[PDB]
Amino acid sequence: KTSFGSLKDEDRIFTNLYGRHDWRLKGAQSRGDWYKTKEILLKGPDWILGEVKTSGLRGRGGAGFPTGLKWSFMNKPSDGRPKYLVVNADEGEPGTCKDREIIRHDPHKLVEGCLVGGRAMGARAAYIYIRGEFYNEASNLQVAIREAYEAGLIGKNACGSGYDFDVFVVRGAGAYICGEETALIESIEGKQGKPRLKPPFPADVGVFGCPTTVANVETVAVSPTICRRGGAWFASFGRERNSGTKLFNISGHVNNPCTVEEEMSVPLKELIEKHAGGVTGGWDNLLAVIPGGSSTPLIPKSVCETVLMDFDALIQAQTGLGTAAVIVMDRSTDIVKAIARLIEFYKHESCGQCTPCREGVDWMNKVMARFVRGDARPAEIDSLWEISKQIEGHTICALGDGAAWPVQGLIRHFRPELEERMQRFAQQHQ
Amino acid sequence: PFDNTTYKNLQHHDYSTYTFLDLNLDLSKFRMPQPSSGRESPRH
Amino acid sequence: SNLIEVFVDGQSVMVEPGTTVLQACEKVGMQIPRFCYHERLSVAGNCRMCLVEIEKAPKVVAACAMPVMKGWNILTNSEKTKKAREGVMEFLLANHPLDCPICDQGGECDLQDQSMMFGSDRSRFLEGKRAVEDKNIGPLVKTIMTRCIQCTRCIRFASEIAGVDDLGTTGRGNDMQVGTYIEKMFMSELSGNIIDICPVGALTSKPYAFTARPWETRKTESIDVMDAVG
Amino acid sequence: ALFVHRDTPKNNPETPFDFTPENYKRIEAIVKNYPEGHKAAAVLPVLDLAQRQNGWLPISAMNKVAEILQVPPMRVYEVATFYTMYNRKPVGKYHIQVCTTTPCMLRNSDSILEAIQKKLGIKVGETTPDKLFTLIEVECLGACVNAPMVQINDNYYEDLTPKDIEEIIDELKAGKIPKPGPRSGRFSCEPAGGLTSLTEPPKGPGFGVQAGL
Ligand SMILES: NC(=O)C1=CN([C@@H]2O[C@H](COP(=O)(O)OP(=O)(O)OC[C@H]3O[C@@H](n4cnc5c(N)ncnc54)[C@H](O)[C@@H]3O)[C@@H](O)[C@H]2O)C=CC1
Ligand SMILES: Cc1cc2nc3c(=O)[nH]c(=O)nc-3n(C[C@H](O)[C@H](O)[C@H](O)COP(=O)(O)O)c2cc1C
Ligand code: SF4
Ligand code: SF4
Ligand code: SF4
Ligand code: FES
Ligand code: FES
Ligand SMILES: [K+]
């Protein structure tokens, strides 16, 4: 196919996304959930991983790793230790609230995804790490898990298969760095949420020292629909190596911010003008677009017109898809203040274990505050770029890269505004 | 019938400050015995 | 024998499996710069001084933690290794106080020596440094946490060797302090050894404080007689 | 915003504190939830339970959690200081948290804040004289498509206007609990100007399953 977008309503995986049906077991089973799951559990982990590999499903957390290879990293014999599948539901990334809607409205899809993923790698039990502030969503998930346990779907002889399974929920304590998989693994174990170094990878040494596979909410909940509908159906959408459907959160200076399921290769402008109502003041009132939240650099209107919102095309556009969160800023926005607020958010949310992030994020916060006040020199700006090059690639986890990227994008795409601001401050105050 | 005009998720207005923990205590009876690490604690 | 062959600067050497990059470079004969790694403590890997570049790999690895593999060529003194070391020194000295002439670690400080022999020679930091309030842990360690770099040798020594488990890191981010969170007197039979494993002048021998200086001292080897360990 | 504890008369290790027997049963369920030999993994939830017994954490729940779980108290101190959910100071009965990250700052959360100061007469991090409300500024809470938004205790109030949050304050002053949902024309996350998708009925089970399942 050449023109993408405009996903059909019958091909949308996440039905009852807006909460227009019942979220309990009766509403879940009347929409197509928990159908022939016993055959899925009986056909074998190799068959399940083959169906995942045929679909071409990639990591929806924000890194875009192939889910088939990562899930096949556990296809090894047991060594006297159990195996665990952990579903990441921290949701600390600004601009992204799709997994909150998935948990609050369709929890049984997530539970069936946990069971299918646990059988797919021989996991003894599943843990779900939810945010501390998501008390009502955690309570809804607990109600759904209790109704699944009481109906014999999971527990002893789960879904009439002979392979037992347990699903747990562990509530967080309000930390963004706990969204990282190794910091999440450490936070489950009662330690502080500080990430580990890889190697050892979590597939070898994870939670409690046992083998552990950490996966996003939507890349887990899609898997029952992958195993039921088929590999070719899920691989038909989008370009090659970018297959599937994605939940896009459009927010910012838009008339109707929302969360919408769409095909992968939908253009940005078409998606905004169709599923969100367009930018206030017209499309020509657009100034900047953040494509996937705080972990990717912004792009201007000159490139946003003809860009494709998948991994490869946005990587070619010197940015990243990330969590697919379209933040929109129009021409009436002080984007220096927006990047300063983003860097201050990173300053307030940083685990501080490894020193380059721990010092350079506060350094960037001070430099951005001086830039907002305009008390800066032009020769400082390139130095700031060099500071980013001392953070990107020298950190334990990827929060340092996610801190260096928005400043690099802001400099690269809006240097004349920064020079104008500092020249204006120098002309006025001196 | 087919209804898509009412917000059906109205249960969350009836949750106290002890809903999650009491639900976990009620759900603990369905769970299997946990695996053992061979010791009481790493500091034991 | 299962000794695999690795390369350091194009020179072959055979190591046992599980040998780190730092251990292989030490076996060849270059001592890789480090701040948090200790050969008698658990590996932490939270200072990034030991970042070296393996060739045909577009990322610098931590030599204190990453195990070697067959055929790995460790470019110990390439361009990006020196760039990473200079960036780490700039970040480390970004918030360090100008306290060398009042310090008791002056002349025997790891930070000063590694800053001269690996780091740059001028500061781009034009902002205000942080100031951490001091604590007390007894009359054996003069405590100045303004100079701490959060290397986390305190917690590993107090948990692994001393085995008292009272030191820790409280806070998140730039406001993290290595303390005890209470007015607790850290007193064990091997307390003063923490003074030996502070690469900066954060922890000072209190009776020795402000009395001497390393370059004017004469070192004489001797045997301890206060116990029967010898 | 301090990470060191001083021995105050209100907050001392000798302050009386204990779990209720129902809280002890919940604590035992949380302990049984985890594998044997790793009871320290129950440090994070059980301490949370202690907050739900008090609303704030003195330094007696830290030592108590160390006593039941047989962990050193400094690990409990590290856990309670690393995370921002634990209130280590006595907060009011209603804990207002306003989000001011970029997707919420773009949709004028500053008007909501200025309404809070102009209504209640306290600054950020300042308490009311009757200890009923405490206003703090927080990061993103995962309600970005419903910006602007605040949270109170465990409830979310999204798509707020200054008049709406003033009315929320007066309704809380009457003692009634408000409705934790978006206050605009939308329900949870749908576009306000009609539904873009999901208007067709769900297709039910067995829709296009692969052969041989
Ligand atoms: N979803 C969210 O809320 C947020 C997402 N992100 C995104 O997260 C990403 C950073 O996270 P990561 O998962 O660490 O990125 P990526 O570098 O690590 O790796 C992707 C996945 O592949 C696995 N992997 C790669 N090579 C492996 C190997 N040889 N053996 C075993 N496993 C291997 C990793 O464990 C990980 O789960 C960024 O792309 C960032 O944009 C960032 C912030 C928030
Ligand atoms: C700082 C940081 C925060 C992250 N936060 C989240 C998160 O909140 N939710 C999530 O699913 N992944 C998050 N990730 C990505 C995870 O490392 C990992 O990609 C995810 O748990 C599973 O990835 P997958 O989609 O390939 O299975 C974060 C990564 C980093 C570096
Ligand atoms: S980059 Fe920052 S958040 Fe990540 S491990 Fe290092 S100090 Fe922690
Ligand atoms: S610890 Fe070292 S670098 Fe720091 S003030 Fe003392 S002598 Fe100077
Ligand atoms: S006081 Fe010294 S030894 Fe202790 S953590 Fe700080 S730098 Fe390391
Ligand atoms: S010595 Fe390896 S990171 Fe510190
Ligand atoms: S930015 Fe405010 S809820 Fe996410
Ligand atoms: K010292």
mmCIF file of N, CA and C in Angstrom, chain A residues 239-301:
data_model
loop_
_atom_site.group_PDB
_atom_site.id
_atom_site.type_symbol
_atom_site.label_atom_id
_atom_site.label_comp_id
_atom_site.label_asym_id
_atom_site.label_seq_id
_atom_site.Cartn_x
_atom_site.Cartn_y
_atom_site.Cartn_z
ATOM 1 N N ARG A 239 4.378 0.047 6.704
ATOM 2 C CA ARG A 239 5.476 -0.384 5.855
ATOM 3 C C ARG A 239 6.121 -1.640 6.434
ATOM 4 N N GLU A 240 7.089 -2.186 5.705
ATOM 5 C CA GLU A 240 7.877 -3.290 6.231
ATOM 6 C C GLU A 240 8.743 -2.809 7.389
ATOM 7 N N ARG A 241 8.949 -3.705 8.359
ATOM 8 C CA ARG A 241 9.657 -3.474 9.619
ATOM 9 C C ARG A 241 9.013 -2.392 10.485
ATOM 10 N N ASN A 242 7.795 -1.958 10.163
ATOM 11 C CA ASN A 242 7.052 -0.980 10.952
ATOM 12 C C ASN A 242 5.584 -1.371 11.027
ATOM 13 N N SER A 243 5.315 -2.660 11.206
ATOM 14 C CA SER A 243 3.955 -3.165 11.109
ATOM 15 C C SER A 243 3.209 -3.019 12.429
ATOM 16 N N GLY A 244 1.896 -2.836 12.326
ATOM 17 C CA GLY A 244 1.009 -2.857 13.468
ATOM 18 C C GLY A 244 0.134 -1.626 13.537
ATOM 19 N N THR A 245 -0.665 -1.575 14.600
ATOM 20 C CA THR A 245 -1.496 -0.427 14.932
ATOM 21 C C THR A 245 -0.999 0.194 16.230
ATOM 22 N N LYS A 246 -1.110 1.516 16.324
ATOM 23 C CA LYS A 246 -0.569 2.248 17.457
ATOM 24 C C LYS A 246 -1.623 3.178 18.040
ATOM 25 N N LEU A 247 -1.547 3.365 19.357
ATOM 26 C CA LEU A 247 -2.376 4.328 20.069
ATOM 27 C C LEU A 247 -1.635 5.657 20.141
ATOM 28 N N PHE A 248 -2.194 6.687 19.514
ATOM 29 C CA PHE A 248 -1.576 8.002 19.468
ATOM 30 C C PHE A 248 -2.318 8.940 20.409
ATOM 31 N N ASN A 249 -1.569 9.606 21.285
ATOM 32 C CA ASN A 249 -2.107 10.623 22.183
ATOM 33 C C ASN A 249 -1.752 11.987 21.607
ATOM 34 N N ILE A 250 -2.750 12.698 21.099
ATOM 35 C CA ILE A 250 -2.549 14.036 20.556
ATOM 36 C C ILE A 250 -2.963 15.039 21.621
ATOM 37 N N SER A 251 -2.048 15.940 21.979
ATOM 38 C CA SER A 251 -2.306 16.918 23.024
ATOM 39 C C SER A 251 -1.499 18.179 22.750
ATOM 40 N N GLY A 252 -1.784 19.214 23.534
ATOM 41 C CA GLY A 252 -1.128 20.494 23.369
ATOM 42 C C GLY A 252 -2.104 21.595 23.016
ATOM 43 N N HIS A 253 -1.785 22.379 21.994
ATOM 44 C CA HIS A 253 -2.675 23.440 21.526
ATOM 45 C C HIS A 253 -3.522 22.945 20.355
ATOM 46 N N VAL A 254 -4.342 21.940 20.652
ATOM 47 C CA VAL A 254 -5.245 21.326 19.689
ATOM 48 C C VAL A 254 -6.662 21.510 20.217
ATOM 49 N N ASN A 255 -7.626 21.620 19.296
ATOM 50 C CA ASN A 255 -9.022 21.818 19.679
ATOM 51 C C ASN A 255 -9.551 20.641 20.492
ATOM 52 N N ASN A 256 -9.279 19.417 20.043
ATOM 53 C CA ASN A 256 -9.745 18.205 20.716
ATOM 54 C C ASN A 256 -8.572 17.261 20.939
ATOM 55 N N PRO A 257 -7.836 17.423 22.040
ATOM 56 C CA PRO A 257 -6.827 16.419 22.402
ATOM 57 C C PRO A 257 -7.494 15.092 22.730
ATOM 58 N N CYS A 258 -6.858 13.995 22.326
ATOM 59 C CA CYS A 258 -7.512 12.695 22.433
ATOM 60 C C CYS A 258 -6.478 11.580 22.351
ATOM 61 N N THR A 259 -6.975 10.348 22.454
ATOM 62 C CA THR A 259 -6.208 9.132 22.219
ATOM 63 C C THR A 259 -6.944 8.308 21.172
ATOM 64 N N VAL A 260 -6.254 7.960 20.090
ATOM 65 C CA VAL A 260 -6.897 7.323 18.944
ATOM 66 C C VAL A 260 -6.016 6.192 18.423
ATOM 67 N N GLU A 261 -6.637 5.055 18.114
ATOM 68 C CA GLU A 261 -5.940 3.968 17.440
ATOM 69 C C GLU A 261 -5.821 4.273 15.954
ATOM 70 N N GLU A 262 -4.663 3.958 15.378
ATOM 71 C CA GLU A 262 -4.432 4.259 13.973
ATOM 72 C C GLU A 262 -3.412 3.282 13.405
ATOM 73 N N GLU A 263 -3.339 3.242 12.076
ATOM 74 C CA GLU A 263 -2.279 2.520 11.389
ATOM 75 C C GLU A 263 -0.934 3.187 11.661
ATOM 76 N N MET A 264 0.144 2.433 11.434
ATOM 77 C CA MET A 264 1.466 2.915 11.820
ATOM 78 C C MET A 264 1.938 4.064 10.933
ATOM 79 N N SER A 265 1.801 3.936 9.614
ATOM 80 C CA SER A 265 2.422 4.882 8.693
ATOM 81 C C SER A 265 1.522 6.066 8.350
ATOM 82 N N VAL A 266 0.660 6.485 9.269
ATOM 83 C CA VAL A 266 -0.201 7.649 9.025
ATOM 84 C C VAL A 266 0.646 8.918 9.064
ATOM 85 N N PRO A 267 0.447 9.864 8.144
ATOM 86 C CA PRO A 267 1.147 11.150 8.244
ATOM 87 C C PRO A 267 0.697 11.944 9.462
ATOM 88 N N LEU A 268 1.597 12.806 9.947
ATOM 89 C CA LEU A 268 1.326 13.588 11.151
ATOM 90 C C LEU A 268 0.200 14.592 10.921
ATOM 91 N N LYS A 269 0.270 15.330 9.807
ATOM 92 C CA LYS A 269 -0.720 16.361 9.513
ATOM 93 C C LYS A 269 -2.098 15.758 9.286
ATOM 94 N N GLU A 270 -2.159 14.636 8.562
ATOM 95 C CA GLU A 270 -3.429 13.953 8.339
ATOM 96 C C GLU A 270 -4.027 13.455 9.648
ATOM 97 N N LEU A 271 -3.191 12.891 10.525
ATOM 98 C CA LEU A 271 -3.669 12.394 11.812
ATOM 99 C C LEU A 271 -4.220 13.522 12.677
ATOM 100 N N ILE A 272 -3.513 14.657 12.729
ATOM 101 C CA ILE A 272 -3.979 15.792 13.527
ATOM 102 C C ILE A 272 -5.278 16.353 12.958
ATOM 103 N N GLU A 273 -5.330 16.553 11.639
ATOM 104 C CA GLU A 273 -6.505 17.173 11.041
ATOM 105 C C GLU A 273 -7.706 16.238 10.995
ATOM 106 N N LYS A 274 -7.499 14.927 11.125
ATOM 107 C CA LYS A 274 -8.619 13.992 11.115
ATOM 108 C C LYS A 274 -9.099 13.656 12.525
ATOM 109 N N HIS A 275 -8.215 13.112 13.358
ATOM 110 C CA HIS A 275 -8.627 12.557 14.639
ATOM 111 C C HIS A 275 -8.508 13.538 15.796
ATOM 112 N N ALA A 276 -8.134 14.791 15.538
ATOM 113 C CA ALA A 276 -7.955 15.742 16.627
ATOM 114 C C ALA A 276 -8.563 17.114 16.383
ATOM 115 N N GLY A 277 -8.955 17.457 15.157
ATOM 116 C CA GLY A 277 -9.576 18.733 14.879
ATOM 117 C C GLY A 277 -8.644 19.831 14.415
ATOM 118 N N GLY A 278 -7.347 19.570 14.336
ATOM 119 C CA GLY A 278 -6.404 20.547 13.835
ATOM 120 C C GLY A 278 -5.906 21.497 14.910
ATOM 121 N N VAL A 279 -4.831 22.203 14.573
ATOM 122 C CA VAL A 279 -4.219 23.171 15.477
ATOM 123 C C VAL A 279 -5.086 24.421 15.524
ATOM 124 N N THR A 280 -5.187 25.027 16.709
ATOM 125 C CA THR A 280 -5.963 26.250 16.869
ATOM 126 C C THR A 280 -5.339 27.389 16.071
ATOM 127 N N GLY A 281 -6.179 28.132 15.356
ATOM 128 C CA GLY A 281 -5.706 29.167 14.464
ATOM 129 C C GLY A 281 -5.308 28.694 13.085
ATOM 130 N N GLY A 282 -5.671 27.470 12.707
ATOM 131 C CA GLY A 282 -5.307 26.921 11.419
ATOM 132 C C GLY A 282 -4.028 26.105 11.475
ATOM 133 N N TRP A 283 -3.796 25.354 10.395
ATOM 134 C CA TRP A 283 -2.592 24.532 10.317
ATOM 135 C C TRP A 283 -1.339 25.384 10.166
ATOM 136 N N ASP A 284 -1.452 26.544 9.517
ATOM 137 C CA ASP A 284 -0.317 27.446 9.378
ATOM 138 C C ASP A 284 0.040 28.154 10.679
ATOM 139 N N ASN A 285 -0.786 28.022 11.716
ATOM 140 C CA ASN A 285 -0.461 28.533 13.041
ATOM 141 C C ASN A 285 0.431 27.583 13.829
ATOM 142 N N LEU A 286 0.772 26.426 13.267
ATOM 143 C CA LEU A 286 1.664 25.489 13.934
ATOM 144 C C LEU A 286 3.083 26.041 13.996
ATOM 145 N N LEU A 287 3.738 25.846 15.139
ATOM 146 C CA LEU A 287 5.135 26.222 15.311
ATOM 147 C C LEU A 287 6.048 25.017 15.469
ATOM 148 N N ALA A 288 5.724 24.096 16.374
ATOM 149 C CA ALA A 288 6.571 22.934 16.592
ATOM 150 C C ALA A 288 5.723 21.742 17.007
ATOM 151 N N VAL A 289 6.240 20.548 16.724
ATOM 152 C CA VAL A 289 5.586 19.301 17.101
ATOM 153 C C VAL A 289 6.616 18.417 17.787
ATOM 154 N N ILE A 290 6.308 17.976 19.000
ATOM 155 C CA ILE A 290 7.055 16.911 19.658
ATOM 156 C C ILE A 290 6.400 15.589 19.264
ATOM 157 N N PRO A 291 7.119 14.677 18.608
ATOM 158 C CA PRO A 291 6.462 13.506 18.011
ATOM 159 C C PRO A 291 6.073 12.427 19.010
ATOM 160 N N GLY A 292 6.899 12.201 20.027
ATOM 161 C CA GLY A 292 6.646 11.110 20.946
ATOM 162 C C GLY A 292 6.940 11.386 22.405
ATOM 163 N N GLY A 293 6.814 12.635 22.824
ATOM 164 C CA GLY A 293 7.033 12.994 24.209
ATOM 165 C C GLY A 293 8.444 13.477 24.478
ATOM 166 N N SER A 294 8.776 13.497 25.769
ATOM 167 C CA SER A 294 10.013 14.090 26.263
ATOM 168 C C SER A 294 11.272 13.366 25.802
ATOM 169 N N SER A 295 11.161 12.139 25.305
ATOM 170 C CA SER A 295 12.326 11.338 24.961
ATOM 171 C C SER A 295 12.792 11.534 23.525
ATOM 172 N N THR A 296 12.199 12.463 22.784
ATOM 173 C CA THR A 296 12.564 12.690 21.395
ATOM 174 C C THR A 296 12.612 14.186 21.111
ATOM 175 N N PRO A 297 13.506 14.623 20.223
ATOM 176 C CA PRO A 297 13.566 16.047 19.878
ATOM 177 C C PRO A 297 12.364 16.490 19.058
ATOM 178 N N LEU A 298 12.077 17.786 19.147
ATOM 179 C CA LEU A 298 10.970 18.392 18.428
ATOM 180 C C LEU A 298 11.318 18.575 16.952
ATOM 181 N N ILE A 299 10.283 18.789 16.142
ATOM 182 C CA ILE A 299 10.453 19.053 14.715
ATOM 183 C C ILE A 299 9.642 20.287 14.331
ATOM 184 N N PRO A 300 10.104 21.081 13.357
ATOM 185 C CA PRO A 300 9.349 22.273 12.958
ATOM 186 C C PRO A 300 8.277 21.968 11.926
ATOM 187 N N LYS A 301 7.568 23.005 11.477
ATOM 188 C CA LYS A 301 6.479 22.823 10.525
ATOM 189 C C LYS A 301 6.976 22.466 9.129
#
